[PDB]
A paper describes a structure:
The exosome is a multiprotein complex that participates in the processing and degradation of RNA molecules. Several studies have linked exosomes to the quality control of messenger RNA (mRNA), the turnover of cytosolic messenger RNA (mRNA), and the processing of short noncoding RNA (sncRNA). Archaeal exosomes, unlike those of eukaryotes, contain only two RNase-PH-like subunits, Rrp41 and Rrp42.
The TaciRrp41 and TaciRrp42 structural component revealed a heterodimeric complex structure of the exosome core at 2.3 Å. The overall exosome structure of Taci consists of nine subunits, three TaciRrp41 and TaciRrp42 heterodimers forming a hexameric ring structure and capped on one side by three subunits of TaciRrp4. Both TaciRrp41 and TaciRrp42 have an RNase-PH-like fold, with the characteristic of β-α-β layers of secondary structure elements. When the TaciRrp41 and TaciRrp42 subunits combine to form a complex, it was observed that the ninth β strands of each subunit aligned in an anti-parallel manner. Consequently, a total of eight β strands from each subunit were arranged in an anti-parallel structure. Also, four salt bridges were found to contribute to the stabilization of dimerization. The central chamber within the ring contains three phosphorolytic active sites located at the interface between TaciRrp42 and TaciRrp41. Furthermore, many arginine residues from TaciRrp41 and TaciRrp42 are involved in forming a positively charged region around the inorganic phosphate. When superimposed on this structure, the position of the P1 phosphate coincided with the phosphate-binding site of S. sol.
Residue numbers in the entry: 9 to 236, 304 to 538
The structure:
């Protein structure tokens, strides 16, 4: 019925209680280093190769080594058989774990080198990315790769009003929030952080403290496993660039919006069509998001162009729309369990001048407000698509000692490390995403949360 009954969880744990965690180094013969980890229902093998010369020589870098973490899921690792090979989700995980490890590995010691980290999840519970990352640290040590700290992390979240630790798959699927965080323990700087769902500033700060406390026991399992006042433009730090929104830019779609954010220009388009719902969720419609980093937008684009970035943007934008519950996907049922409304949100980037995530969010929100779902084709009165909230994403980076928001492209590259905080008009936080190589202090993340709430308020009323 409920996930907690006696203040006791469906598997019997207290609120801040870890699942069983085991770690086992050296298990593999070929890998320079390796680690096997069991974390609740998670079984993950990690192998480490390198450092070695970078292949292909295209990707090579003369300053430092490149950390190529690859996250792969066995076909038999999830509920239903899944086709082998990467998908959008495993590439984003591979990117976000690569970036984290790039902060702890001493990449500068190995110019032109590559360090391969292979994360093979054999059976997945929830929190696989953090278990993989926690075991990668042990694998890298098992291989003798030099590091300046040992990355470790944990999840937390909200389940039936309670903040809990190390969520299960069911708590992830049906709970109110999920918050993966990895840190460098010596300093406590955050090298991985994401957040899905619905949470208050106070709840987010509590979940963080629970995670930070949890890593003390987890860092120990790792060790014993081895023992065996203005910007360059006029803008102030809280100031966005000029915006121009043009709704119904593509009248032949169901909804759309052209957005310019400074010199960053995207147009979002919404195509709503009848389709078959999920066999899991039969009384909910579908929202699928995609953001195209068109070669037209940047000179370097079609070098790389990177898809990693385009996939990351698409997920962070989708996450904000989804977790804000903007769409109200229950009102989009045509024939319960046979026909629902598929809401395609496609965003084409035509000009890139920084802050693609926020510009895309603004476009998405605006385009979803020309709602006009065509109900007249499957019966009907054409009705406006229910809009229940206004999620604003705010993206933030650190220039020197001062946090700014809406970075230009110039600011976007000067400092490694960005953080996106999406909020709704109730002052709840719905999604977060730490990006790029670089760490943030807890204070930075706290200032980020406050700044994003403040400037999102201003944003929402002005547009």
């Amino acid at each position: 019925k409920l996930i907690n009954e006696d203040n006791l969880r469906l598997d019997g744990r207290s609120f801040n209680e870890l699942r069983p965690i085991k770690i086992q180094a050296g298990v593999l013969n070929r890998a320079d280093g390796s680690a096997y980890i069991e974390w609740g229902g998670n079984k993950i093998m990690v192998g480490v190769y390198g450092p070695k010369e970078a292949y292909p020589k295209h990707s090579q870098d003369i300053d430092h080594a490149i950390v190529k973490a690859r996250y792969n899921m066995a076909a038999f690792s999830v509920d239903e058989r899944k086709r082998p090979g990467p998908d959008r989700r495993t590439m984003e995980i591979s990117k976000v774990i690569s970036e984290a490890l790039s902060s702890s590995i001493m990449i500068e010691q190995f110019p032109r080198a590559e360090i391969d980290v292979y994360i093979e999840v054999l059976q997945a519970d929830a929190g696989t990315r953090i278990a993989g990352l926690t075991a990668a640290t042990v694998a890298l040590a098992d291989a003798g790769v030099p590091m300046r700290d040992m990355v470790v992390g944990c999840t937390a979240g909200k389940v039936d009003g309670h903040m809990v630790l190390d969520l299960s798959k069911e708590e992830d699927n049906y709970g109110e929030a999920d918050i993966p965080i990895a840190i460098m323990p010596k300093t406590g700087d955050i090298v991985l952080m994401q957040m899905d769902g619905d949470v208050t500033e106070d709840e987010l700060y509590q979940a963080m403290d629970m995670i930070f406390e949890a890593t003390k026991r987890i860092s120990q399992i790792q060790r014993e496993a081895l023992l065996n006042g203005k910007r360059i433009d006029g803008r102030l730090p809280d100031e966005f660039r000029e915006l121009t929104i043009i709704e119904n830019y593509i009248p032949r779609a169901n909804g759309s919006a052209y957005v310019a954010l400074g010199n960053t220009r995207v147009v979002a388009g919404v195509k709503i069509e009848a389709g078959e719902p999920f066999p899991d969720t039969p009384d909910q419609g579908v929202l699928t998001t995609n953001v195209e980093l068109l070669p037209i937008a940047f000179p370097s684009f079609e070098a790389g162009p990177p898809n990693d970035l385009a996939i990351e943007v698409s997920r962070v934008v989708d996450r904000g729309i989804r977790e804000s519950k903007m769409i109200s996907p229950e009102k989009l049922v045509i024939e319960q369990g046979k026909k629902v409304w598929i809401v395609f949100l496609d965003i084409n980037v035509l000009d890139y001048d920084g802050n693609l995530i926020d510009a895309s969010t603004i476009a998405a929100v605006a385009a979803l407000r020309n709602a006009v779902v065509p109900a007249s084709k499957e019966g009907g009165e054409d009705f406006k698509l229910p809009v229940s909230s206004t999620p604003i994403s705010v993206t933030m980076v650190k220039i020197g000692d001062t946090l700014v928001c809406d970075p230009s492209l110039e600011e976007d590259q000067i400092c490694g490390g960005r953080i996106t905080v999406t909020t709704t008009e109730d002052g709840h936080i719905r999604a977060m995403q730490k990006g790029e190589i670089g760490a943030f202090t807890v204070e930075d993340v706290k200032k980020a949360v406050k700044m994003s709430l403040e400037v999102g308020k201003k944003l929402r009323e002005k547009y």
